[PDB]
Amino acid sequence: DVYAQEKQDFVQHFSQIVRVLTEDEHPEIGDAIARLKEVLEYNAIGGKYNRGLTVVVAFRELVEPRKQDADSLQRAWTVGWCVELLQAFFLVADDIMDSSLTRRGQICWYQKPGVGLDAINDANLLEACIYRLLKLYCREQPYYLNLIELFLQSSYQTEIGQTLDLLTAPQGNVDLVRFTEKRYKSIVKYKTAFYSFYLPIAAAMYMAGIDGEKEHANAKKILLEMGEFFQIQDDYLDLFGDPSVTGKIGTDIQDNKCSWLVVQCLQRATPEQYQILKENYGQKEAEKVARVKALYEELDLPAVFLQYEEDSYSHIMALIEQYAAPLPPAVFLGLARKIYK
């Protein structure tokens, strides 16, 4: 199946990404260029690569095989890596802001001795590398401007979502009245759904000459719903996932987050259970985090999630029947395979 079978070529392209991004070689900036290399190697490697792979997979399925020459394929791999660099940028910053410990099975970049808040600048550089690659590989192409604007708009939407995530989770401050379903859905749409799901497909679409507003709108209808489910899954796994598989320690309860779990908890709790949540949520103490987990399990939240995943899967399939044409349904189906496993 198409992801595991594009992966190896995609991952190996990375050394080429790095080599080209390292050839501002103004010898004066050598030390900075060496730091950038270290940043890329630590922060763009070690995840599943699904976002960037979706660009490559979708490209193969949308573009005429006779138009898949060596050069247009290189361009597809680079644009895929651009989506991974955007993810790297976002995660480095998000880990600082969420006070996280590990990411992708290693200590977070900013927690590394000798890095600290220098990682703010490292994250901004990763972002800059996107537009540097687009220029180096794509500047002659009809879709150059489309891609630039797509990446910029995706970043803006994600930052708006991050803003809502952060505003809804003020540190050291109760009230659970904030944590509603309406609010939750807006957060994840902006913070997750656009850049994780719309962006990589849309990018492949523009690359294939599919630039019509109506087709992008239809694709977006499916892709934003997939993104909502994916963030709900990320929230569930924050508490109930195995860190050896997720690669990261969860912080949602201590960070006072509007998680899907807390929203579902609030919908189900007796007034007595509400008070337990209220006395215990949003705080660093292990014993307090453990009481919240216990309330979640008392309320059968893992069972609620398993049932939602099934409902969500069926709903997304219904949307693909409605909205996929005229693109190959396989494009969306491959994606859904990846997240609903």
Add this chain to the structure above:
Amino acid sequence: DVYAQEKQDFVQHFSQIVRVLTEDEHPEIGDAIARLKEVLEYNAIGGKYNRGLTVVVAFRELVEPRKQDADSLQRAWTVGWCVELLQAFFLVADDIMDSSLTRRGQICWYQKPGVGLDAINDANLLEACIYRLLKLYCREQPYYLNLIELFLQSSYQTEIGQTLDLLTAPQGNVDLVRFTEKRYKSIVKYKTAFYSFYLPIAAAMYMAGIDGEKEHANAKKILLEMGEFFQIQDDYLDLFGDPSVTGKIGTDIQDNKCSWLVVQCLQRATPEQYQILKENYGQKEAEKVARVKALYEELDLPAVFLQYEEDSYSHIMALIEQYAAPLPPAVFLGLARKIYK
């Protein structure tokens, strides 16, 4: 003179910038859009506006008065504000990374109670606003892509410079062997000179249809040298400026920075003076910072700076004679008036 006489119109345009950036009005994102407003108001207001004003001034001097209609003037003011938003983005992050206390006569954004490291995301949003304004005001214009690429390339160069600034100043770590003149000049060229001086002129140039590589190269020759002097001045004022005028408390010595002052100090010190510097530089203790200042004054560094400012002024004027044509020398002269006062 042209800056004080464009200022009032420029500053008043801000409420329009804010209003337009606040009209994603998706009511769901309202809380985020209100946070953005607060971010803009705190972080883009209260400086001298010289970078954005340079766009407006240069525009009036480069564009045929018959082509200065109401709409092209609005576009000039917006692009000016784009340069100020880039500065706001950079300063918010730089203040976190330099551990600063005040900026523009108020507490730094990230030090504000209830902000903290959320300011990382606030800074990224400010950056995103640039490209949002370019699209809203400039997308139909021949120079749209030129401007996008100029802002992106300026950001990349500045981030590379920030990288060198940070690498040369490792926290808690001596050696002064790092602090050379060669190194110093590379830092400030990248971190300061491109975005502070080349960017706003270049932007006006592209807006006026002046897109020739050779003309940009000539303009850059003057503007990068002005930028070097301006950063040298910023370093001098970090220690010897009056905070009520600069608007900020200096941190260069405690932050272990490759300041122009330390570089000049190192060039002049006896081995005994070297040891004092070495025992005292790069540390939070007021008494230690005071010994470094005392060494600087013992070495007459304020007198060395006054003499350099004069030499530098004459050199820059020589470059304007050489390199200005065919642009009006007034463009560069206005700028030099602003910084050499």
